[PDB]
Amino acid sequence: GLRRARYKFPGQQKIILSKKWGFTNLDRPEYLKKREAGEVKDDGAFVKFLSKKGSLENNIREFPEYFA
Amino acid sequence: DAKSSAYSSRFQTPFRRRREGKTDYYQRKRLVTQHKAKYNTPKYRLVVRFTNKDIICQIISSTITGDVVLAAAYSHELPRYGITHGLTNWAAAYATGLLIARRTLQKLGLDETYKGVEEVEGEYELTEAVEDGPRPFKVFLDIGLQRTTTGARVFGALKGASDGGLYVPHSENRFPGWDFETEEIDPELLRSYIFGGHVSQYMEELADDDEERFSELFKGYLADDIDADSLEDIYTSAHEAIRADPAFKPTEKKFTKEQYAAESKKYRQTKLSKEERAARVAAKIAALAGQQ
Amino acid sequence: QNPMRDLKIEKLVLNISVGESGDRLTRASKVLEQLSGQTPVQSKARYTVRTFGIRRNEKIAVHVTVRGPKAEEILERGLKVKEYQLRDRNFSATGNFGFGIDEHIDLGIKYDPSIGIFGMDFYVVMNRPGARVTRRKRCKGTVGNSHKTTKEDTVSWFKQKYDADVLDK
Amino acid sequence: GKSHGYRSRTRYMFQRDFRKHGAVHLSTYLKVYKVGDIVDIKANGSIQKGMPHKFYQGKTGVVYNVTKSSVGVIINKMVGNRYLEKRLNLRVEHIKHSKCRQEFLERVKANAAKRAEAKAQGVAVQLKRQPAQPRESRIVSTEGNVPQTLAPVPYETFI
RNA sequence: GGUUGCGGCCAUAUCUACCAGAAAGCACCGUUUCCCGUCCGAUCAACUGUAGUUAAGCUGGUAAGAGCCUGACCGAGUAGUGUAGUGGGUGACCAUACGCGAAACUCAGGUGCUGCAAUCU
RNA sequence: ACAGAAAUCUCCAGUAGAACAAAAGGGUAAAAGCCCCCUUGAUUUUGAUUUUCAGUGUGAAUACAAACCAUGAAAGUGUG
RNA sequence: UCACCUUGACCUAUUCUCAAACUUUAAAUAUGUAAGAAGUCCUUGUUACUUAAUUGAACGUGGACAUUUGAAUGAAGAGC
Ligand SMILES: [Mg+2]
Ligand SMILES: [Mg+2]
Ligand SMILES: [Mg+2]
Ligand SMILES: [Mg+2]
Ligand SMILES: [Mg+2]
Ligand SMILES: [Mg+2]
Ligand SMILES: [Mg+2]
Ligand SMILES: [Mg+2]
Ligand SMILES: [Mg+2]
Residues of C in contact with B22 (CB under 8 A): 138-139
Mutation for B interface: A52, A55, A56, A58, most B CBs within 10 A: A56
Report yes or no: B135 and B110 within 8 Å, Cβ to Cβ: no
Distance D94 CA to ligand 8 centre (A): 29
- In this complex, the nucleotide whose C1' atom is nearest to the CA atom of residue B24 is F30
Distance D89 CA to ligand 7 centre (A): 21
Report yes or no: D58 and D41 within 8 Å, Cβ to Cβ: yes
Helix (H, G, I), strand (E, B) or coil at C113: coil
For residues C15 and C169, what is the distance between their CA atoms, to the nearest angstrom?
24
Q: Could you check: is the Cβ of residue D26 within 7 Å of any atom of nucleic acid strand F?
A: no
For residues D72 and D88, what is the distance between their CA atoms, to the nearest angstrom?
5
Report yes or no: C32 and C64 within 8 Å, Cβ to Cβ: yes
Nearest residue to B151 (alpha-carbon basis) of B197, B204, B99: B197
Report yes or no: C19 and C43 within 8 Å, Cβ to Cβ: no
Residue D97 φ/ψ, nearest 5 degrees: -70, 145
Q: How far is CA A48 from the centre of its chain?
A: 8
Count other Cβ atoms within 10 Å, centred on residue B259: 9
Residues with Cβ < 8 Å from C169, sequence gap 6 or more?
C85
Kindly tell me whether chain D and chain C come into contact, counting contact as 3+ Cβ pairs under 8 Å. no
Please, what sign has the CA dihedral across residues D38, D43, D49, D52? Answer: positive
For residues C72 and C10, what is the distance between their CA atoms, to the nearest angstrom?
10
- Please give the C-alpha separations between residue B100 and each of B82, B105, C6, C31, C118, in angstroms, as whole numbers: 16, 9, 43, 56, 61
Please, what sign has the CA dihedral across residues C125, C128, C129, C135? Answer: negative
For residues B231 and B86, what is the distance between their CA atoms, to the nearest angstrom?
10
Which ranges of B150-251 does DSSP label H, i.e. alpha helix? Answer: 156-162, 187-194, 197-206, 213-216, 219-223, 231-244
Burial of D111 (0-12, 13-18, 19+ CB in 10 A): middle
Residue B114 φ/ψ, nearest 5 degrees: 60, 65
User: Radius of gyration over alpha carbons of chain B, in Å?
Assistant: 25
Helix (H, G, I), strand (E, B) or coil at D10: coil
Record: contact C139-B147, CB cut-off 8 A = no
Chain breaks after residues in chain A, where C lies over 2.5 Å from next N: none
Report yes or no: B68 and B61 within 8 Å, Cβ to Cβ: yes
Burial of B242 (0-12, 13-18, 19+ CB in 10 A): buried
The residue lying closest to nucleotide E19, measuring its CA against C1', is: B269
Could you tell me if A17 lies within 8 Å of chain B, comparing CB atoms?
no
Across the strands, what pairs with C86? C166
| Method for this entry | cryo-EM
Record: contact D158-A19, CB cut-off 8 A = yes
Nearest residue to B63 (alpha-carbon basis) of D99, D37, D27, D92: D27
For residues B234 and B226, what is the distance between their CA atoms, to the nearest angstrom?
9
For residues B251 and B263, what is the distance between their CA atoms, to the nearest angstrom?
19
Residue D34 φ/ψ, nearest 5 degrees: -110, 165
The alpha carbon torsion through B159, B163, B165, B170 (nearest 10 deg) reads 40
Q: Could you check: is the Cβ of residue D2 within 7 Å of any atom of nucleic acid strand F?
A: no
Q: Could you check: is the Cβ of residue C126 within 7 Å of any atom of nucleic acid strand F?
A: no
Residues with Cβ < 8 Å from D29, sequence gap 6 or more?
B29, B32, B33, D92, D93
Min Cα separation D154/chain A (Å): 16
- In this complex, the nucleotide whose C1' atom is nearest to the CA atom of residue D38 is G33
Kindly tell me whether chain A and chain C come into contact, counting contact as 3+ Cβ pairs under 8 Å. no
Q: In what side-by-side order are the strands of the sheet with C120-127?
A: C41-43, C61-66, C8-16, C120-127, C97-101
For residues C14 and C104, what is the distance between their CA atoms, to the nearest angstrom?
13
Across the strands, what pairs with B32? none
Chain F footprint bases within 7 A of protein beta carbons: 1-4, 6-16, 25-32, 48-52, 54-55, 60-65, 72-78
Residues of D in contact with A26 (CB under 8 A): none
Resolution (A): 3.0
Helix (H, G, I), strand (E, B) or coil at C90: coil
Give distance CA D30 / C1' E10 (Å): 16
For residues B185 and B173, what is the distance between their CA atoms, to the nearest angstrom?
7
Nearest residue to C63 (alpha-carbon basis) of C21, C123, C127: C123
For residues D67 and D87, what is the distance between their CA atoms, to the nearest angstrom?
14
Residues of A in contact with B289 (CB under 8 A): 60, 64, 66-68
The residue lying closest to nucleotide F16, measuring its CA against C1', is: B11
Count other Cβ atoms within 10 Å, centred on residue B60: 20
Nearest residue to B107 (alpha-carbon basis) of B260, B264, B247: B247
Report yes or no: A50 and A56 within 8 Å, Cβ to Cβ: no
Kindly tell me whether chain B and chain C come into contact, counting contact as 3+ Cβ pairs under 8 Å. yes
Q: Identify which of D24, D29, D68 has the shortest CB distance to residue B32.
A: D29
Residues of D in contact with A16 (CB under 8 A): 157, 159
Distance D16 CA to ligand 7 centre (A): 28
- Please give the C-alpha separations between residue B173 and each of B120, B122, B146, B149, B176, in angstroms, as whole numbers: 18, 13, 16, 9, 8
Q: Could you check: is the Cβ of residue D14 within 7 Å of any atom of nucleic acid strand F?
A: yes
**If you measure CA to CA, which chain C residue comes closest to B50?**
C138
DSSP code of residue D24: P
